Amino acid sequence: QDIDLLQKHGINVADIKKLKSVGICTIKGIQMTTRRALCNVKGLSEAKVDKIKEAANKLIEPGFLTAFEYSEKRKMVFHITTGSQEFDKLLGGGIESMAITEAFGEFRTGKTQLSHTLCVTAQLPGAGGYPGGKIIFIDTENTFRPDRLRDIADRFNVDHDAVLDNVLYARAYTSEHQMELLDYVAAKFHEEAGIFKLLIIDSIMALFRVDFSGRGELAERQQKLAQMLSRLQKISEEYNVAVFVTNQMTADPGAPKKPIGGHILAHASTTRISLRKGRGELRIAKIYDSPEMPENEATFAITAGGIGD
Amino acid sequence: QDIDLLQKHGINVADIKKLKSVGICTIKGIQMTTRRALCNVKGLSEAKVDKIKEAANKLIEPGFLTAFEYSEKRKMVFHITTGSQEFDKLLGGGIESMAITEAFGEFRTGKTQLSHTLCVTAQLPGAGGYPGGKIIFIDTENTFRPDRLRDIADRFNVDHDAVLDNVLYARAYTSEHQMELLDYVAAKFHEEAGIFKLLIIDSIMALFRVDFSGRGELAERQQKLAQMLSRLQKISEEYNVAVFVTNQMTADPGAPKKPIGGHILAHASTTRISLRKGRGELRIAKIYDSPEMPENEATFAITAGGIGD
Amino acid sequence: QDIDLLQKHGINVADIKKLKSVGICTIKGIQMTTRRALCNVKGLSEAKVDKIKEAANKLIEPGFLTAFEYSEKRKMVFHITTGSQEFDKLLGGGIESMAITEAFGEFRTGKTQLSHTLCVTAQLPGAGGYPGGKIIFIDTENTFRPDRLRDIADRFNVDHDAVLDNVLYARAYTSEHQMELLDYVAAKFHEEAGIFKLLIIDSIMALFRVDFSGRGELAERQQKLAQMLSRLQKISEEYNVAVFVTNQMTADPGAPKKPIGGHILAHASTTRISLRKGRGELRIAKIYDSPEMPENEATFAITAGGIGD
DNA sequence: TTTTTTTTT
DNA sequence: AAAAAAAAA
Ligand SMILES: Nc1ncnc2c1ncn2[C@@H]1O[C@H](COP(=O)(O)OP(=O)(O)NP(=O)(O)O)[C@@H](O)[C@H]1O
Ligand SMILES: Nc1ncnc2c1ncn2[C@@H]1O[C@H](COP(=O)(O)OP(=O)(O)NP(=O)(O)O)[C@@H](O)[C@H]1O
Ligand SMILES: Nc1ncnc2c1ncn2[C@@H]1O[C@H](COP(=O)(O)OP(=O)(O)NP(=O)(O)O)[C@@H](O)[C@H]1O
Ligand SMILES: [Ca+2]
Ligand SMILES: [Ca+2]
Ligand SMILES: [Ca+2]
């Protein structure tokens, strides 16, 4: 896995620590790079890069796996329960582990409350043999009240301070700061294989819609967004972790609500979960663009303690 | 067909295995090569290449076929049904076997669901004397959930594990990795003549729009795309197989949706099928740029089980 | 016409069959050759070529024709109707017979549909005393569906299989293969004087833009293109036939669409017909660079059956 | 000579 | 109802 399996094939140790200084730490890191990105770095020439690709095919052989084998290959994925019964009946165990999940609501619909439950149910050994592990929370608005975890820890009957250390927290302040903070995620995931389970970005579009103006800087903004979602897709295959992202909404005076992000965000997301209000403490949850489950509905209950029934 | 029919015309066996190491395996492989591409390879001189072209015209004679003969020549093409009745009424048997078909939707419109049905209906002996065979699936986003094949296998009344081996799967990770993986397709098609029927690339533009930036690397990206579509056109004549490609969409603040790819992709595609949403589980399918069928519409139904009515 | 009229002027028969092996078949073939091209061939010396030019001026005398005589000299040209009324009102009988015509569209604009009608209307005895004859179709993309001729044969009330033999078909696979296939056209035209009327290349730039890269091989590509267009100009005077060529288009992020080919193709073409989309099954056709008709517009209708009104 | 990208309220 | 930008071989 770690990139020391190449030095027995002609690679000298003088520059294999150099690609570590960019951030590459795994044998799939050279599988997930363009050949011109290794033209940009200080001190690697255009005519020596082929010897790293010499040890790429003879260590990770890109033949043609049959889908029968790929059926047993995909058994390593896991599922995170949401807290309810009909909500992960709507998903099939909840959140997939090799895909990007989206959830958008009006304003009060309980997006971060769904996230705050997921910092608690994901460290408990549950269904599917899922053993539970550590969480990274990348907040961007302000909403990481930690004492809200302590109420949900009671209704699952867990100790308080045993769970307040297994979540990692950092707030981005700028849309470029949100991008560079993904490099710390790659360093944090690699040195402990298997102790982390999922990652939460609070709202990817909470800073992109502010730092960029309207029709002038629109293509500048949508191009920088595509680099972020592609990097998150690479991490979810590199370490087999889940990602959960939310975003805001906007109106439509041309007609009546659409989630912001445009076509770039709608294509790159694997499952989108629409959330609308019902009656009192009840919320309705539809499902948009899923590779499994058709458009059916469920019913939450945001409680004292997150998602219930 | 195989390139051993040339050695009886003066070609020595010392370098006919050399052009095999590039990838050339058929008597049309020398028909589909520039004369300067055989100047680039290690150990073949500029003044000996004519003896391969000596056995080219006396084995494949490029005279002038009349179109009456070409009418009976084109009877070897086949047609893949999609799953509906009005949808291949809109196409005339469905997918052609010597052409490139395109299909683009908004985001939830069911592009990969149309692909997932085509991995099932193409191995069943159907209309036009089409006997069915094996499929190659080149995925690029992430969407190859194999258990979705098992639902569609029921509504055609086929065994489960008899069809999960006749599809081959590989995921490209990089836009250059997608190009070199076509060379494995040529090796896989050649050694078994007639057991493969079609090929699916998931989304050719899913990695080209990410790995390349805006107006700086635009001409660099569009030139590398033209090498890919021309290689796919050569394979579809070399082995008589069908190809099915999808792509994303983009907006237009100059006006209102256009499929990405530019003029290069729009010219090289033979039929393009627009897909838009109707009501509930119904989708509308128009047709763009076809050499037969004029602009008429139909109506899907994505079901439990892919395309219905 | 045939080169046996020279042997009565001192030319021995030992080498007049030699210039036949290059491809020269007519008395204008020595009028259309450089004197250094007859230095390159195996077995003809630099000091004997003048005796062929001895019988050149005393058989084709290059004096000074007056334009009054040239007015009656040019009566042998003919005109091919396209299928509409305002479209050849825009051209003046349609396609000239001693010139190169060009037509370029966006992607769906009906370029090959205009070609498919021209394989049918050119074998019918129509206006101007044009008697009709045989057609050569040099396809290069893939688009020669022959059953599309059978629909247009009905709306002109012609037999089906009487017209499916008078069109000759060949597909080029490589940009050098497209060049050498013009030598078969010269052999096919010469032995039957007057039974052929026109020639269609599908898209000259469909293979030149693929087989050659960007700014490296640009001058290499544009030099090889100029040899092709000059050879086509020589054939259209050697046998008095029409030629119809199409090409793709490209964008312009420096500004917004331009036809590809550069200045070489724009100069060597005699008439260029721009094609853009109107409403539904209607197309608008402007005219670029014509030696007659000024910039006026018309309106097609691609039908069941090609071009209508 | 060559090559199009990008929704917001 | 109504808004604009961005370059490399
Ligand atoms: N302990 C609690 N008991 C009952 N309701 C609660 C409790 N805590 C929070 N809520 C409610 O849960 C909702 C919070 O949803 P929330 O996810 O915070 O919205 P949001 O995602 O933050 N949208 P926005 O605040 O505009 O960014 C509100 O209706 C709160 O009143
Ligand atoms: N098991 C199933 N049975 C029937 N229909 C299903 C099934 N699972 C998914 N679908 C349908 O598939 C639709 C989404 O189709 P999909 O092919 O994912 O479009 P898509 O454009 O490829 N999504 P994306 O990859 O983000 O662009 C859903 O809206 C469902 O209607
Ligand atoms: N026989 C026919 N009957 C009905 N409609 C037709 C017929 N032939 C063509 N069309 C319509 O005309 C369009 C095809 O135009 P076409 O002449 O193929 O453009 P093109 O520029 O040759 N395509 P491309 O090679 O991709 O650039 C399609 O959108 C069809 O709907
Ligand atoms: Ca919030
Ligand atoms: Ca998809
Ligand atoms: Ca065409």
Side-chain angles (χ1 to χ4, degrees):
Chain A
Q1 174 153 355
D2 193 31
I3 43 170
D4 289 345
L5 295 174
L6 318 177
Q7 64 197 358
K8 53 200 61 50
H9 309 312
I11 294 169
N12 44 18
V13 175
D15 286 59
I16 193 168
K17 293 179 179 179
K18 179 209 166 162
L19 275 96
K20 174 61 155 97
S21 61
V22 189
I24 295 94
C25 285
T26 178
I27 198 155
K28 261 187 172 220
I30 45 173
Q31 295 282 325
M32 300 194 145
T33 59
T34 66
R35 293 182 183 174
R36 293 182 183 174
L38 308 176
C39 213
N40 282 152
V41 67
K42 281 82 199 183
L44 197 146
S45 152
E46 327 195 15
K48 293 179 179 179
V49 76
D50 52 355
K51 79 178 309 179
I52 307 106
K53 306 309 285 195
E54 193 174 351
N57 54 329
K58 69 181 177 180
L59 295 174
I60 302 273
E61 155 68 39
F64 272 124
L65 295 174
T66 184
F68 182 76
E69 183 178 2
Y70 190 49
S71 64
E72 294 107 18
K73 177 63 166 299
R74 269 187 70 90
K75 303 198 307 303
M76 57 189 156
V77 312
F78 47 88
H79 269 275
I80 324 286
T81 179
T82 59
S84 168
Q85 292 316 112
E86 299 91 356
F87 196 37
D88 289 345
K89 262 177 190 174
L90 189 57
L91 297 178
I95 308 180
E96 208 79 86
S97 64
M98 288 209 309
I100 289 188
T101 60
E102 205 195 350
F104 56 97
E106 196 176 351
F107 69 97
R108 70 216 171 280
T109 323
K111 289 182 281 268
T112 66
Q113 307 288 325
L114 185 46
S115 87
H116 267 305
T117 315
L118 282 164
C119 311
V120 177
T121 77
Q123 57 194 349
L124 309 182
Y130 166 64
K134 283 186 174 183
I135 316 295
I136 297 185
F137 194 94
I138 302 182
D139 183 83
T140 178
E141 195 181 35
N142 217 344
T143 60
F144 194 64
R145 320 297 199 215
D147 49 338
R148 265 282 309 170
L149 307 175
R150 287 187 266 246
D151 184 44
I152 322 169
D154 307 345
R155 67 180 291 270
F156 290 110
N157 296 249
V158 201
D159 199 5
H160 266 192
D161 301 323
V163 312
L164 260 294
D165 289 345
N166 293 322
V167 292
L168 288 176
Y169 169 71
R171 168 169 168 181
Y173 296 93
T174 300
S175 58
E176 293 177 350
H177 188 100
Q178 187 187 12
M179 173 56 195
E180 293 177 350
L181 188 147
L182 297 195
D183 297 304
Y184 283 79
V185 179
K188 206 64 66 178
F189 274 3
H190 157 257
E191 45 175 48
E192 296 91 8
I195 211 64
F196 279 93
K197 286 311 167 184
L198 69 91
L199 159 68
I200 300 135
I201 311 190
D202 198 333
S203 64
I204 36 176
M205 308 302 296
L207 289 183
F208 279 121
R209 91 184 308 184
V210 167
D211 299 18
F212 293 101
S213 173
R215 214 170 62 156
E217 313 172 323
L218 171 70
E220 257 68 18
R221 170 191 87 123
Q222 292 288 126
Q223 278 164 18
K224 269 196 179 58
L225 176 58
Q227 317 292 330
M228 179 161 307
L229 291 167
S230 91
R231 183 80 177 276
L232 296 166
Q233 187 54 77
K234 289 182 173 184
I235 292 180
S236 166
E237 312 292 71
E238 199 167 308
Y239 312 99
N240 192 24
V241 298
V243 279
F244 180 78
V245 175
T246 80
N247 61 326
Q248 319 178 346
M249 286 187 94
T250 184
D252 188 345
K257 292 191 303 306
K258 290 192 302 222
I260 82 180
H263 287 319
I264 289 293
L265 183 48
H267 276 300
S269 64
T270 300
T271 58
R272 320 178 79 184
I273 307 170
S274 158
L275 267 72
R276 63 174 148 89
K277 203 193 189 304
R279 285 301 307 120
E281 300 195 22
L282 299 191
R283 306 283 184 274
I284 314 292
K286 217 206 283 190
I287 175 161
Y288 273 14
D289 193 51
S290 64
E292 302 154 335
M293 317 296 231
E295 300 207 338
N296 312 126
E297 306 185 337
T299 297
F300 297 147
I302 294 169
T303 60
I307 313 293
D309 275 320
Chain B
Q1 174 153 355
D2 193 31
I3 43 170
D4 289 345
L5 295 174
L6 317 177
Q7 64 197 358
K8 53 200 61 50
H9 309 312
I11 294 169
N12 44 17
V13 175
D15 286 59
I16 193 168
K17 293 179 179 179
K18 179 209 166 162
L19 275 96
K20 174 61 155 97
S21 62
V22 189
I24 295 94
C25 285
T26 178
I27 198 155
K28 261 187 172 220
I30 45 173
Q31 295 282 325
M32 300 194 145
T33 59
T34 66
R35 293 182 183 174
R36 293 182 183 174
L38 308 176
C39 213
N40 282 151
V41 67
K42 281 82 199 183
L44 197 146
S45 152
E46 327 195 15
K48 293 179 179 179
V49 76
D50 52 355
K51 79 178 309 179
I52 307 106
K53 306 309 285 195
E54 193 174 350
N57 54 329
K58 69 180 177 180
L59 295 174
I60 302 273
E61 155 68 39
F64 273 124
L65 295 174
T66 184
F68 182 76
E69 183 178 2
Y70 190 48
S71 64
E72 294 107 18
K73 177 63 165 299
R74 269 187 70 90
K75 304 198 307 303
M76 58 189 156
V77 312
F78 47 88
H79 269 275
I80 324 286
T81 173
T82 59
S84 168
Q85 292 316 112
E86 299 91 356
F87 196 37
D88 289 345
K89 262 176 190 174
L90 189 57
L91 297 178
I95 308 180
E96 208 79 86
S97 64
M98 288 209 309
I100 289 188
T101 60
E102 205 195 350
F104 56 97
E106 196 176 351
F107 69 97
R108 70 216 171 280
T109 323
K111 289 181 281 268
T112 66
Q113 307 288 325
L114 185 46
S115 87
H116 267 305
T117 315
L118 282 164
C119 311
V120 177
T121 77
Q123 56 194 349
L124 309 182
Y130 166 64
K134 283 186 174 183
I135 317 295
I136 297 185
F137 194 94
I138 302 182
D139 184 83
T140 178
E141 195 181 35
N142 217 344
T143 60
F144 194 64
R145 320 297 199 215
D147 49 338
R148 265 282 309 170
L149 307 175
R150 287 187 266 246
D151 184 44
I152 323 169
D154 307 345
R155 67 180 291 270
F156 290 110
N157 296 249
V158 201
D159 199 5
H160 266 192
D161 301 323
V163 312
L164 260 294
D165 289 345
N166 293 322
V167 292
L168 288 176
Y169 169 71
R171 168 169 168 181
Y173 296 93
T174 300
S175 58
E176 293 177 350
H177 188 100
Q178 187 187 12
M179 173 56 195
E180 293 177 350
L181 188 147
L182 297 195
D183 297 304
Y184 283 79
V185 179
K188 206 64 66 178
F189 274 3
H190 157 257
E191 45 175 48
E192 296 91 8
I195 211 64
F196 279 93
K197 286 311 167 184
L198 69 90
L199 159 68
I200 300 135
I201 311 190
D202 198 333
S203 64
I204 36 176
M205 308 302 296
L207 289 183
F208 279 121
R209 91 184 308 184
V210 167
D211 299 18
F212 293 101
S213 173
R215 214 170 62 156
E217 313 172 323
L218 171 70
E220 257 68 19
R221 170 191 87 123
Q222 292 288 126
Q223 278 164 18
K224 269 196 179 59
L225 176 58
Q227 317 292 330
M228 179 161 307
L229 291 167
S230 91
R231 183 80 177 276
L232 296 166
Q233 187 55 77
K234 289 182 173 184
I235 292 180
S236 166
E237 312 292 71
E238 199 167 308
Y239 312 99
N240 192 24
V241 298
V243 279
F244 180 78
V245 175
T246 80
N247 61 326
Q248 319 178 346
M249 286 187 94
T250 184
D252 188 346
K257 292 191 303 306
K258 290 191 302 222
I260 82 180
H263 287 319
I264 289 293
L265 183 48
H267 276 300
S269 64
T270 300
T271 58
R272 320 178 79 184
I273 307 170
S274 158
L275 267 72
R276 63 174 148 89
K277 203 193 189 304
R279 285 301 307 120
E281 300 195 22
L282 299 191
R283 306 283 184 274
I284 314 292
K286 217 206 283 190
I287 175 161
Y288 273 14
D289 193 51
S290 64
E292 302 154 335
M293 318 296 231
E295 300 207 338
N296 312 126
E297 306 185 337
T299 297
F300 297 147
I302 303 301
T303 60
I307 313 293
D309 275 320
Chain C
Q1 174 153 355
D2 193 31
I3 43 170
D4 289 345
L5 295 174
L6 318 177
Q7 64 197 358
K8 53 200 61 50
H9 309 312
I11 294 169
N12 44 17
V13 175
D15 286 59
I16 193 168
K17 293 179 179 179
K18 179 209 167 162
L19 275 96
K20 174 61 155 97
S21 61
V22 189
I24 295 94
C25 285
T26 178
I27 198 155
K28 261 187 172 220
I30 45 173
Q31 295 282 325
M32 300 194 145
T33 59
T34 66
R35 293 182 183 174
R36 293 182 183 174
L38 308 176
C39 213
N40 282 152
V41 67
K42 281 82 199 183
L44 197 146
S45 152
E46 327 195 15
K48 293 179 179 179
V49 76
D50 52 355
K51 79 178 309 179
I52 307 106
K53 306 309 285 195
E54 193 174 351
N57 54 329
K58 69 180 177 180
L59 295 174
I60 302 273
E61 155 68 39
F64 273 124
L65 295 174
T66 184
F68 182 76
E69 293 177 350
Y70 190 49
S71 64
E72 294 107 18
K73 177 63 165 299
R74 269 187 70 90
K75 304 198 307 303
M76 58 189 156
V77 312
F78 47 88
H79 269 275
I80 324 286
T81 173
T82 59
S84 168
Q85 292 316 112
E86 299 91 356
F87 196 37
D88 289 345
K89 262 177 190 174
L90 189 57
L91 297 178
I95 308 180
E96 208 80 86
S97 64
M98 288 209 309
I100 289 188
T101 60
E102 205 195 350
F104 56 97
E106 196 176 351
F107 69 97
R108 70 216 171 280
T109 323
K111 289 182 281 268
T112 66
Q113 307 288 325
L114 185 46
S115 87
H116 267 305
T117 315
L118 282 164
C119 311
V120 177
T121 77
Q123 56 194 349
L124 309 182
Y130 166 64
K134 283 185 174 183
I135 316 295
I136 297 185
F137 194 95
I138 302 182
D139 183 83
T140 178
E141 195 181 35
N142 217 344
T143 60
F144 194 64
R145 320 297 199 215
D147 49 338
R148 265 282 309 170
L149 307 175
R150 287 187 266 246
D151 184 44
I152 323 169
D154 307 345
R155 67 180 291 270
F156 290 110
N157 296 249
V158 201
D159 199 5
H160 266 192
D161 301 323
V163 312
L164 260 294
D165 289 345
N166 293 322
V167 292
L168 288 176
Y169 169 71
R171 168 169 168 181
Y173 296 93
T174 300
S175 58
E176 295 302 320
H177 188 100
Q178 187 187 12
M179 173 56 195
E180 293 177 350
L181 177 63
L182 297 195
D183 297 304
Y184 283 79
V185 179
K188 206 64 66 178
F189 274 3
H190 157 257
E191 45 175 48
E192 296 91 8
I195 212 64
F196 279 93
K197 286 311 167 184
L198 69 91
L199 159 68
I200 300 135
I201 311 190
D202 198 333
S203 64
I204 36 176
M205 308 302 296
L207 289 183
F208 279 121
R209 91 184 308 184
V210 167
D211 299 18
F212 293 101
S213 173
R215 214 170 62 156
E217 313 171 323
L218 171 70
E220 257 68 18
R221 170 191 87 123
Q222 292 288 126
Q223 279 164 18
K224 269 196 179 58
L225 176 58
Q227 317 292 330
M228 179 161 307
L229 291 167
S230 91
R231 183 80 177 276
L232 296 166
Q233 187 55 77
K234 289 182 173 184
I235 292 180
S236 166
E237 312 292 71
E238 199 167 308
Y239 312 99
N240 192 24
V241 298
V243 279
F244 180 78
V245 175
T246 80
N247 61 326
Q248 319 178 346
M249 286 187 94
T250 184
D252 188 345
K257 292 190 303 306
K258 290 192 302 222
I260 82 180
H263 287 319
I264 289 293
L265 183 48
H267 276 300
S269 64
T270 300
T271 57
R272 320 178 79 184
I273 307 170
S274 158
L275 267 72
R276 63 174 148 89
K277 203 193 189 304
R279 285 301 307 120
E281 300 195 22
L282 299 192
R283 306 283 184 274
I284 314 292
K286 217 206 283 190
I287 175 161
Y288 273 14
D289 193 51
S290 64
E292 302 154 335
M293 317 296 231
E295 300 207 338
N296 312 126
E297 306 185 337
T299 297
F300 297 147
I302 294 169
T303 60
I307 313 293
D309 275 320

